[PDB]
Write a protein that binds this ligand. Structure first.
Ligand SMILES: O=C1Nc2ccc(Cl)cc2[C@@](C#CC2CC2)(C(F)(F)F)O1
Lengths: 557, 405
């Protein structure tokens, strides 16, 4: 049919006119094809004849269908589209299975010839005009325009979905108990009714749709959950991901690894523990897509654990609005975090992992915070509310770090849960100087054109060392100078630097960094029992900085 | 009545901003408010032919359990600046900040009386999302002047004047300033008489179909937040080294801060613990330097043309310090904010600061907020109470918190 429903008025972009692309000459058999096809559409309203008054022409093609049985009509709209107005996005998101409510009965209906069952705005048809050529361009050729939504045009998806929504509003209203999710030309209908009263309602729906020009299946409802959708397998009861299968092969090409990594990351939504750190490390570097990569020891095992986790099927359960949401986060390895979200102890709704680095120099308390943020945001989109957290951090550790940190931080209602590794700050910086403790006045400098520096120091006990360096910046000479003060130095040491930069990194108690020096300076810090770091203005001549600065920048500067 | 014709800054096109995901409770809050706003014909549903979007949230009144709709028109305000700032701007009284008392009145419901140029409406399109995207998602557009829009005050400026006219003639020493949704009313009366003159004003408003809240500011008591220098009985190398660090800072701001005496004082290579004597030039330099640090920077003037910037540092213990300035380290004003959640507090500080800002300059500042973008976005609309939304970029505070500015 052709739905009575009002039509969405569309227009072309401001400073533009309809399309005018010449029709490239087609072969005889093709010309026959289109003729047989259009005529067909025409007899049904989908299109109509028009004369040579319409200066708008858009190219047409035809290509064989499956096994070359019948032809198909391809209308390269590239031109009308660049000239067509912009619309409102069809879907700005996809429901996550875990956010769906459990249903008793569910069936999927699919709108046949959807785009062609909706009436294109009259004032716009004139632009969707094409032509069926004459053998070796002689005769005029047949001209046709559209009266319904062209299957390749910019606004068919938008306009179709909008219409299907107006067509459903009455029905949904009459049956608020029936949930209907519309994905493209498919309709997912679920209810808490009995398969009997369900199918009854279904027909009632097919009817309502018919009254509107939309034809729907009869016994080919495809309902019968399972439901393979968007990579998921939906059941009225639970849900899980499309079946994953790990190749299991001798040699792996870059292309193979990527696919693997892609599947495992897809599996991680419900399969707890999936790890891809080792496998992902193997893809660093511009490598041919067909290039074979040998699996390192680490990787070989990681693929094993994953292999293990995937053998037994795992399902996620559906959302119950009446219950709370609990989210527990575990620390897997370094920089890696996994989490589970459930309502009833251990019957997971969704799973996931966080590994994001987030700049160089960061510490577990900061990362845990980040995972909490991500899980929170995700939790809102899917369920509409934030969950309660069960974190592997002491209320103590958290309270202390948060209150002193420069950045403002929050974190929804949480609870400690002793699930090692527990998160902790691996060292603290004294606030008041350490009395009766050597005071290293470190410093550094480096010639910019040469790249030669002299990281050194001087103490209140006469000691004064000056090691030379090659290929270091003005910064590293200050970060290297602090590394020194930590080595030839006691268990308690006061360090006085003039590198706000160095002060910055160290002051944020990082326990892992991307800098080689910074990770070294960390071991030290974790070994001392008392470290005090202070700052003083660079080469501004101060008691101590000046002096070290002298043997630091005397020559090679 | 007739509609005022509005246009966008040529070259620029309507807003196409994404709708931040909302919690169930605010979605329900909003479909109720929008369901009712439609009956009253203030907004009409729209179709996919509208590609535009401006985000929306739901906040709380002056703590009353009634949810208010908050449309984030930050974008469209930028796309319209020409219209509401030059073409139909609203003058700002330099006298307002001098008033002993200033009351803020929410005259926003007053805009829904005027219609919006039928041609501009498409630009006010907004979307009420749905949980887990299980539903297309309700779309609308304004027919009447919307509230977060800086275009609304400008147009309504003509009517507001007729309304206030009598009250103003009978009360010449009372300043009235309108700034996007709110009226600021200040007088040098005694709290009693002031509060009284306010009720009087509400009665006038009331006659043009417009009720009111409350909420009083005291600008004449807004003072600078000096940069303090310690004053301890004892004194350690560390204590004096720091005293030199902060002082040094006070050099690229507050011209004249002499630190040549205090510096070079007790130098060489001494332990940090080692206590030290004192100096006569010291007591003098200190005094003089701090004396200079008490009063405002010399050479710093407000420049109506340039933007305003507010920077905030988390001091600790519910303490927050901030500076408003146009040219880095050239402070127009500095302050403090004190007295549960860090985010909850910070949001409060921003609103306070924005208000002080509006009273003093008539414009809101842009904020350099010491927090993580995602965290802020996820929670601000949970403690926010203003009708406006300032500009904000998320910065990374340096070890500058040492000095208060
Ligand atoms: O709320 C539910 N519950 C549900 C339970 C089991 C199955 Cl299979 C399907 C659903 C459903 C859906 C959907 C589309 C994203 C796949 C339905 F709309 F009901 F069809 O959304």
């Amino acid at each position: 049919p052709i739905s009575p429903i009002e039509t969405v008025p569309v227009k072309l972009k401001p400073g533009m006119d309809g399309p005018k692309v010449k029709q490239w000459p087609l072969t005889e058999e093709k010309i026959k094809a289109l003729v047989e096809i259009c005529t067909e559409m025409e007899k049904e309203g989908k299109i109509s004849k028009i004369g040579p008054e319409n200066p708008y022409n858009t190219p047409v093609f035809a290509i064989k269908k499956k096994d070359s049985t019948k032809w198909r009509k391809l209308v390269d709209f590239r031109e009308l589209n660049k000239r067509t107005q912009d619309f409102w996005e069809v879907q700005l998101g996809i429901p996550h299975p875990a956010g769906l409510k459990k249903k008793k009965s569910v069936t999927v209906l699919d709108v046949g010839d959807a785009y062609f069952s909706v009436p294109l705005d009259e004032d716009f048809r004139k632009y969707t005009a094409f032509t069926i050529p004459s053998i070796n361009n002689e005769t005029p050729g047949i001209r046709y325009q559209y009266n319904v939504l062209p299957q390749g045009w910019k606004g068919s998806p938008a306009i179709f979905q909008s219409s299907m929504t107006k067509i459903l509003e009455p029905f949904k209203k009459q049956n608020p108990d029936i949930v209907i999710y519309q994905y493209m030309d498919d309709l997912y209908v679920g209810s808490d009714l009995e398969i009997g009263q369900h199918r009854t309602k279904i027909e009632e729906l097919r009817q309502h749709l018919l009254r509107w020009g939309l034809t729907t299946p009869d016994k080919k409802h495809q309902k019968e959950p399972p439901f393979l959708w968007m990579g998921y397998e939906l059941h009225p009861d639970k849900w899980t991901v499309q079946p994953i299968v790990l190749p299991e092969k001798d040699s792996w090409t870059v292309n193979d690894i990527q696919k693997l990594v892609g599947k495992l990351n897809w599996a991680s939504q419900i399969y707890p523990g999936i790890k891809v750190r080792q496998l992902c490390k193997l893809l660093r570097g511009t490598k041919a897509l067909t290039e074979v990569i040998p699996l390192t020891e680490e990787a070989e095992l990681e693929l094993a654990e994953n292999r293990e986790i995937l053998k037994e099927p795992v399902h996620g359960v559906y959302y119950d609005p009446s219950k709370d949401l609990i989210a527990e986060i575990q620390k897997q390895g370094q920089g890696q975090w996994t989490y589970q979200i459930y309502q009833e102890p251990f019957k997971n709704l969704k799973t996931g992992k966080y590994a994001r680095m987030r700049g160089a120099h960061t510490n577990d308390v900061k990362q845990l915070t980040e995972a909490v943020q991500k899980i929170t945001t995700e939790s809102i989109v899917i369920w509409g509310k934030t969950p309660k957290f069960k974190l592997p951090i002491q209320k103590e550790t958290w309270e202390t770090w948060w209150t002193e940190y420069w950045q403002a931080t929050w974190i929804p209602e949480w609870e400690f849960v002793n699930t090692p590794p527990l998160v902790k700050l691996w060292y603290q910086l004294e606030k008041e100087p350490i009395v009766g403790a050597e005071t290293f006045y470190v410093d550094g400098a480096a010639n910019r054109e040469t790249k030669l520096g002299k990281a050194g120091y001087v103490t209140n006990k006469g000691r004064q060392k000056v090691v030379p360096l090659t290929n270091t910046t003005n910064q590293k000479t200050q970060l290297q100078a602090i590394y020194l003060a930590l080595q030839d130095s006691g268990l308690e040491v006061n360090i006085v630097t003039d590198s706000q930069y160095a002060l910055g990194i160290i002051q944020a108690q990082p326990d892992k960094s991307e800098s080689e020096l910074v990770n070294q300076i960390i071991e030290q810090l974790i070994k001392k029992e008392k470290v005090y770091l202070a700052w003083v203005p660079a080469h501004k001549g101060i008691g101590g900085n000046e002096q070290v600065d002298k043997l630091v920048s005397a020559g090679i500067r | 009545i007739e509609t005022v014709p509005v246009k966008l800054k040529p070259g620029m096109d309507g807003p196409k901003v994404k709708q931040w995901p909302l919690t169930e409770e605010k979605i329900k809050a909003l479909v109720e408010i929008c369901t009712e706003m439609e009956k009253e014909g203030k907004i009409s549903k729209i179709g996919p032919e509208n590609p535009y979007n401006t985000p929306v949230f739901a906040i709380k009144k002056k703590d009353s359990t009634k949810w208010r709709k908050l449309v984030d028109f930050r974008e469209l305000n930028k796309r319209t600046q020409d219209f509401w700032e030059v073409q139909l701007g609203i003058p700002h009284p330099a006298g307002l900040k001098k008033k002993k008392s200033v009351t803020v009145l929410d005259v926003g419901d007053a805009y829904f009386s005027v219609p919006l140029d039928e041609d501009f409406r498409k630009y006010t399109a907004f979307t009420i999302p749905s949980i887990n995207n299980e539903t297309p998602g309700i779309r609308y557009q304004y027919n009447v002047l919307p509230q977060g829009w800086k275009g609304s005050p400008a147009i309504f400026q003509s009517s507001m004047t007729k309304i206030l006219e009598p009250f103003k003639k009978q009360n010449p020493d009372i300043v009235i300033y309108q700034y996007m949704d709110d009226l600021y009313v200040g007088s040098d009366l005694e709290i009693g008489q002031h509060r009284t003159k306010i009720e009087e004003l509400r009665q006038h408003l009331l006659r043009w179909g417009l009720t009111t809240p409350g909420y009083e500011l005291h600008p004449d008591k807004w003072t600078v937040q000096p940069i303090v220098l310690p004053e301890k009985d004892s004194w350690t190398v560390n204590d004096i080294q720091k005293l030199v660090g902060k002082l040094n800072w006070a050099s690229q701001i507050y011209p004249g801060i002499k630190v040549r005496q205090l510096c070079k004082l007790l130098r060489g290579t001494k332990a940090l613990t080692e206590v030290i004597p004192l100096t006569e030039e010291a007591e003098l330099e200190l005094a003089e330097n701090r004396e200079i640090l008490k009063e405002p920077v010399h050479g710093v003037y407000y420049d109506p043309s340039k933007d305003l910037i507010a920077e905030i540092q988390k001091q600790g213990q519910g303490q927050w310090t901030y500076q408003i300035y146009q040219e880095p380290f050239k402070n127009l004003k500095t302050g403090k904010y004190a007295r549960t959640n860090d985010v909850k507090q910070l949001t409060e500080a921003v609103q306070k600061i924005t208000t002080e800002s509006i009273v003093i300059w008539g414009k809101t500042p842009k904020f350099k907020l010491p927090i993580q973008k995602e965290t802020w976005e996820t929670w601000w609309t949970e403690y926010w109470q203003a009708t406006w939304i300032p500009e904000w970029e998320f910065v990374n505070t340096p070890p500058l918190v040492k000095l208060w500015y």
